[PDB]
Amino acid sequence: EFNVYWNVPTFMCHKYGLRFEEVSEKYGILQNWMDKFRGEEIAILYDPGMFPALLKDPNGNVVARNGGVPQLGNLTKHLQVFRDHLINQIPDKSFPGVGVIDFESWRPIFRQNWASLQPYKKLSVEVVRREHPFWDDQRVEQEAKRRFEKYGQLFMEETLKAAKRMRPAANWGYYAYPYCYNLTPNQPSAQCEATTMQENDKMSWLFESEDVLLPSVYLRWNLTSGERVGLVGGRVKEALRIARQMTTSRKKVLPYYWYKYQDRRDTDLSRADLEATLRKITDLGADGFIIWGSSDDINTKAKCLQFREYLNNELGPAVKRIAL
């Protein structure tokens, strides 16, 4: 089987009379009943509970939500808020659909918190310096890294188990794991960075307890045709690699797919990119893919009509002829 899921917030277009019934009626895409955003087929939860995170105010200041870094956070407070969000957004206890937890504040591996996520390393190190003024550099750094990676793990594993316990028939997964970093400043080519694969092997606690793996395979316009396919190919092969190593049960590989170029958001994917990239996901043996969209791209009547036009002339037909 191969299943395509609709995770575009087309519920925002319903007050103009566009209900997008053709998503499932003509193209065979799995869609929540009545085109609701959260329902029996799929539900995404953006930043749920109260994960420790570093936020920057408009005032300029750094706001540390629930500690900033996970070693300074309160798990029980996080877990109770996570409970309220889950209950409200997924009220049905027998929800059998794909459950996606979208949490992107920090990565659980200390090293992977580079570029814009560097402040998490800095503050982790800083706290240890405060407690131990005489410790040498190497020592402080090592201890900072062990505390971040222990509690980082703990926050992620305990939220997944709480979701699994309260909605035991759902297929749960974290958005964007496993990472690969191909065609990125850290790894210029189309293969995943070698250290990240080893780090993915070390994260068996995550991949063993999830049901679905969801690498994000968003295309960029400033790439050649072959690299757009290599971009997808690399990430999905990494996910399939992990999945066939898992021991507790079959894992599903459902890549997150966007119909806009991420570096050129006002341009929808060309027909040639849709075909080559959906053909690649299919050829590799993935179990399906999830079509996503942003609120900012269909928050007006004009944006809804144009999206609906793109859907019926290109996206829909491409999904039906290549994938279903």
Other C-beta atoms lying within 10 Å of the C-beta of residue 191:
17
Torsional sign, CA 46, 50, 54, 58: positive
Pairing of strands 62-65, 98-102: unpaired
Of residues 160, 151, 47, the one with CA closest to residue 102: 47
CATH number at residue 266: 3.20.20.70
Residues with Cβ within 8 Å of 19's Cβ and at least 6 positions away in sequence, in order, are 10, 13, 34, 35
User: Is 126 strand, coil or helix?
Assistant: helix
Of residues 40, 7, 78, 39, the one with CA closest to residue 298: 7
- Distance between CA 44 and CA 38 in Å, rounded? 7
Of residues 269, 174, 287, 195, the one with CA closest to residue 231: 269
Pairing of strands 62-65, 264-268: unpaired
Kind and range of the H or E run holding 122: helix 119-131
Task: Please check whether residue 51 is in contact with residue 103, taking contact to mean a CB–CB distance below 8 angstroms.
Answer: yes
- Distance between CA 155 and CA 50 in Å, rounded? 10
Range of the domain at 188: 1-324
Q: How many residues can be counted in the chain?
A: 324
Residues with Cβ within 8 Å of 293's Cβ and at least 6 positions away in sequence, in order, are 7, 8, 9, 10, 258, 259, 260, 307
- Distance between CA 204 and CA 202 in Å, rounded? 6
Q: How many Cα atoms within 13 Å fall on the side-chain side of residue 135?
A: 16
- Distance between CA 170 and CA 256 in Å, rounded? 18
Active site amino acids: 104
Residue bearing tokens 């035991």:
168
Both tokens assigned to 54: 């570093």
Task: Please check whether residue 70 is in contact with residue 32, taking contact to mean a CB–CB distance below 8 angstroms.
Answer: no
- How many separate domains does the chain show? 1
Task: Please check whether residue 127 is in contact with residue 54, taking contact to mean a CB–CB distance below 8 angstroms.
Answer: no
Both tokens assigned to 95: 């929800």
Chain Cα centroid distance, residue 133:
39
Task: Please check whether residue 186 is in contact with residue 112, taking contact to mean a CB–CB distance below 8 angstroms.
Answer: no
